[PDB]
């Protein structure tokens, strides 16, 4: 830190998520002029410094640049996604900070037709495209400034989606679409809405990139740093790369599963000289990065008695035990994603996790 003027005024920003709350005793929720921020009660200094943060229509710039970024992203993928064309609606100037209704930011026109699934979360995995079909598709971009009480992006996304879709005031060309919400305050991103083949991975990758990339967001972030006068101690930053682990700890409970030592065997020689193999106690390795919580499942040799070949059984039993463990777990602690060391595990887990369809299964380009 920075080793009758600002320092007071700065103190407000730093606690501003706590000072200003969506839940208060009494208050009249007010929208800052050109922005999407909602003050509860009148705090002069908070107001001032926030208005510093967003100036020269930085909010509009952020919404715009995000939209443009997506437009280019789809402009690259035309063929793989069977898209006839991509048009950005020239955006209604005030739509960014207008919280009552939203137009459509992007229109995807299909080359032939699209089988469309039921609305689900961006973080969701299992979908059935057999729900319906369409051609036109729309994309909406929502920017909110969070706070301490509700920083949760996902419920917000699905909420605004259900509302704008079910309202008669909002204008969309097709009922099939998706709503992307990004909370600037907490730098969070989620989406809820309809899907079509190939769209989910593209949007996931595109968002994960933009959140690291978009210059507008970097202007916001930097202005926050300056207003707070925070300055980092260490050059080069820790080992961030683009690596998925930094975003991987996040809020989302996410696990690493290692089956390698589940199946182990010891060899000794008989009187014939033939080497014979007796399996030994195995263990299933499960780890949580953010809590350092190590689930170590001790697998006794009793599991290995009579059944055919031991490797595949190690695999399927491993996925089983993971499934039952997640089953006994309270919902608040359940993983949003499960990452795997040995890609051979991808098949059984995907099966044995069908009872929990929203859990993502990912293989590691990263050996650990």
């Amino acid at each position: 830190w920075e080793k009758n003027q600002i320092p007071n005024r700065r103190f407000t920003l730093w606690w501003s998520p706590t000072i200003n709350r969506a839940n208060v005793y009494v208050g009249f929720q007010v929208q800052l002029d050109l922005t999407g921020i909602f003050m509860h009660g009148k705090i002069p200094t908070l107001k001032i410094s926030l208005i510093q943060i967003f100036r020269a229509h930085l909010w509009q710039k952020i919404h715009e640049s995000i939209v443009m970024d997506l437009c280019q992203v789809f402009d690259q993928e035309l063929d793989a996604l069977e898209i006839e064309t991509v048009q950005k609606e020239t955006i209604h100037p005030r739509k960014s900070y207008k919280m009552n209704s939203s137009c459509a930011d992007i229109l995807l026109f299909a080359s032939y037709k699209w089988n469309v699934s039921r609305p689900s979360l961006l973080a969701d995995s299992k979908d059935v495209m057999d729900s319906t079909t369409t051609q036109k598709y729309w994309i909406d971009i929502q920017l909110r400034w969070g706070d301490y009480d509700s920083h949760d992006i996902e419920r917000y996304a699905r909420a605004k989606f259900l509302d704008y879709t079910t309202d008669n005031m909002s204008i969309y060309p097709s009922p099939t679409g998706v709503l992307i919400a990004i909370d600037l305050a907490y730098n969070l991103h989620s989406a809820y809405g309809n899907w079509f083949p190939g769209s989910k991975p593209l949007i996931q990758q595109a968002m994960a990139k933009i959140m690291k990339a978009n210059p507008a967001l970097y202007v916001l972030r930097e202005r926050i740093r300056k207003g707070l006068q925070l300055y980092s101690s260490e050059p080069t930053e820790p080992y961030l790369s683009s690596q998925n682990y930094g975003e991987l700890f996040s809020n989302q409970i996410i696990w690493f599963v290692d089956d390698t030592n589940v199946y182990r065997v010891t060899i000794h020689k008989t009187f014939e000289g033939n080497l014979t193999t007796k399996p030994i106690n195995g263990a299933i390795f499960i780890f949580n990065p953010r809590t350092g919580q190590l689930f170590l499942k001790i697998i006794h040799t009793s599991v290995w008695a009579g059944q055919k070949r031991l490797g595949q059984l190690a695999k399927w039993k491993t996925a089983e035990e993971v499934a039952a463990l997640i089953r006994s777990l309270p919902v608040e602690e359940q993983p949003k994603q499960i990452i795997v060391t040995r890609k051979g595990m991808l098949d059984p887990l995907e099966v044995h996790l069908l009872d929990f369809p929203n859990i993502v299964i990912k293989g590691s380009e990263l050996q650990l």
Binding site: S233, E234, P235, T236
Partner: peptide, 22 residues
């Protein structure tokens, strides 16, 4: 100990490594 511990959190080399290695 972020600023307390060292002037630089990171310096690399194997100089000391390949010297003391043998």
């Amino acid at each position: 100990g972020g600023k307390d511990m060292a002037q630089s959190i990171y310096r690399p080399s194997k100089n000391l490594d390949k010297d003391m290695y043998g």
